[PDB]
Amino acid sequence: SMEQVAMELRLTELTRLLRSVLDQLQDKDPARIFAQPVSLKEVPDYLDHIKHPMDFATMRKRLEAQGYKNLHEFEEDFDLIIDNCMKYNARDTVFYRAAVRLRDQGGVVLRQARREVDSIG
Predict the structure, then answer these.
(1) Crosslinked positions for Glycyl lysine isopeptide (Lys-Gly) (interchain with G-Cter in SUMO2)?
(2) Which of 28, 56, 63, 92 suits 101 as a labelling partner, its CA being 20 to 30 A distant?
(3) Is 30 helix (H, G, I), strand (E, B) or coil?
(4) Which of 39-55 are b and which e, b meaning 16 or more Cβ less than 10 Å from the residue's Cβ?
(5) Are residues 18 and 61 in contact, defined by beta-carbon separation less than 8 angstroms?
(6) Is residue 86 within 8 Å of residue 96, measured between CB atoms?
(7) How far apart are CA 78 and CA 119, in angstroms?
(8) How many domains does the chain have?
(9) Calpha distance 85→31 (Å, rounded)
(10) Angle at which helices 94-119 and 71-88 cross, to 10°
(11) CATH number for the domain including 15?
(12) Which domain holds residue 74?
């Protein structure tokens, strides 16, 4: 149908906007602490601590399969990156501190993306 196609164009455009959002967020992580999944070879107990691991490469795979229906879904995954790190790592660590900075800096970007998603529909 023509409606399914119009729907598919909106999803494609959301995917476009979310890609740019993801690039901006990932720039706030120049150390690449959140680039890739936590290694289960190097942290064998990680899944005893963290039930839903997340990272920027896993979000990117979802993004490119057009797997985010809306900004809320995308934000949930970003928040997992931050929140998992802040539980697993202690306050006085470079990892926890990196998550705090990413959260604080990502807020600005996410604040405008919400306005753009509402605005362009």
Answers:
(1) 41
(2) 63
(3) coil
(4) eeeeeeeeeeebeebbb
(5) no
(6) yes
(7) 22
(8) 1
(9) 14
(10) 170
(11) 1.20.920.10
(12) 1-121
